[PDB]
Design a binder for this molecule. Structure first.
Ligand SMILES: Nc1ncnc2c1ncn2[C@@H]1O[C@H](CSCC[C@H](N)C(=O)O)[C@@H](O)[C@H]1O
Ligand SMILES: O=C1C=C2NC[C@@H](O)C2=CC1=O
Length: 257
């Protein structure tokens, strides 16, 4: 809750998106695995529409790289002001912006359409119309008169819910709250930590509800999704860096019935 007030965006980026976890060179790493699930899913051509919302974007954009070419209106969100400010720095190509080029490249590599990474980042920056505050704990997570087109044709959320939820029940409700933002028939792409109880982000020490793959699936069904795809990545020893206690990472593709 109020722990997210000490959350340092740079430290978080450093902990999860710089080497070793941010080394995209080894295909056996989490970075490549994540981009692969994303890329492969959109490549099916079944996740399509005009609008899309990213839930709890944090200070990261990799989660929209393969997505941006399928939706012309993209909304990014986060609870923290600092995180929206960081997102802004990368969108406006301002100074100090985080460098996502390695990920843009690997997305281009993986997608295999011969695209250059500059055209990818350009497309993303173009299709992201707005960066809105959000709280998944509210029944109306974006608010009343949100500038965001609703309902969205699709949703993306990586490492948010389990990391803002004290327990399974909160998690399930938060899932419910965001699910209302999704048009029926829509698609949800959910990535998150498995069996993780805490992670660091500078002076901030966050509490996490350790969830399992079955608990994630059950939660998706209960929230009213058909689970099209749900995969697990087991965190290798050398990627256990002492910035957290994550055991694995899950990826879910779910369709709203
Ligand atoms: N109550 C809340 N509602 C929505 N998001 C919240 C939230 N409380 C914290 N968050 C955000 O949840 C994010 C989790 S970190 C995830 C960052 C990014 N999605 C990734 O893929 O790395 C944090 O940025 C945090 O600010
Ligand atoms: O909070 C987390 C954020 C992550 N993103 C990459 C993935 O390695 C990861 C694990 C986490 O525990």
């Amino acid at each position: 809750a109020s722990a997210y007030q000490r959350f340092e965006p740079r430290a978080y980026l450093r902990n999860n998106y710089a080497p070793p976890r941010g080394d995209l060179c080894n295909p056996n790493g989490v970075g490549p695995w994540k981009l692969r699930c994303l890329a492969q899913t959109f490549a099916t051509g079944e996740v399509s529409g005009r609008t899309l919302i990213d839930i709890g974007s944090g200070p990261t954009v990799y989660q929209l790289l393969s997505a941006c070419s399928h939706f012309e209106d993209i909304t990014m969100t986060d609870f923290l002001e600092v995180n929206r400010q960081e997102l802004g720095r990368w969108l406006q190509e301002e100074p100090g912006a985080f460098n996502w080029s390695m990920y843009s490249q690997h997305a281009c590599l993986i997608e295999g359409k011969g695209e250059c990474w500059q055209d990818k980042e350009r497309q993303l920056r173009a299709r992201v119309k707005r960066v809105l505050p959000i709280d998944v704990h509210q029944p109306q997570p974006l608010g009343a008169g949100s500038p965001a087109p609703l309902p969205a044709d699709a949703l993306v959320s990586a490492f948010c819910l389990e990391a803002v939820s004290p327990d399974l029940a909160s998690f399930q409700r938060a899932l419910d709250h965001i699910t209302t933002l999704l048009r029926p028939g829509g698609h949800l792409l959910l990535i998150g930590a498995l069996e993780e109880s805490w992670y660091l982000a500078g002076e901030a020490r966050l509490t996490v509800v350790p969830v399992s793959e079955e608990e994630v699936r059950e939660a998706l069904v209960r929230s009213g999704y058909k689970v099209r795809d749900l995969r697990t990545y087991i965190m290798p020893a050398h990627l256990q860096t002492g910035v957290d206690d994550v055991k694995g990472v899950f990826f879910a593709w779910a369709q709203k019935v």
